[PDB]
Design a protein around this ligand. Sequence first.
Ligand SMILES: [Ca+2]
Length: 223
Amino acid sequence: ERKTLVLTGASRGIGHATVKRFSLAGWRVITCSRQDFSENCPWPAGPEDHIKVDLSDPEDIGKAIAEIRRRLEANGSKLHALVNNAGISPKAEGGRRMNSIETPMAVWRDVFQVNFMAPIMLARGLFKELEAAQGSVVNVTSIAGSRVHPFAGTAYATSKAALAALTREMASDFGPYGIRVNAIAPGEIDTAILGKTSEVAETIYFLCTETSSYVTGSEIHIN
Ligand SMILES: [Ca+2]
């Protein structure tokens, strides 16, 4: 019965505020993280709501998808929401911003894999359950996708710009199956890559509930 959310990037700020919003609304919240489940976690969700997965690893993502699908059988194999908030912006030597000149191949690869490929891999991997629920996919974009930012490196900026375009394409592709796909760009950089965050969490929640049933292919720019 209970509506279910799969969330990546459940970090302090936007991620935690989103967990809190959906938890208080009565949803089951399955969080994905590189870390082992710990009883010192802020929310009281048990191990059945935690998925250990490294989103830079396509093999691990396939293993996480299969485990999520098994855990969704407890609700009729429905996934009402997938929220892609995981994002990385690796820094150069000495904690410096990493620009287009200095970014090595391995960073381009891992940043695009986590920030860009994992959202579509998870959405198409969980397609059956999203379709069964006529669910919602939210991709969290960034102001860095549209303007050069002092606190976000080039790989992050370009992968988030790619993610904004991917959101538009996914909405067109997933639409005929009844799955809506939208993006939200917070007004400030997500401090995870280092009141306003509650607004982002509220908007993600809106995009996953009945009032947004007819909205797809949009990108909401929080001002
Ligand atoms: Ca169907």
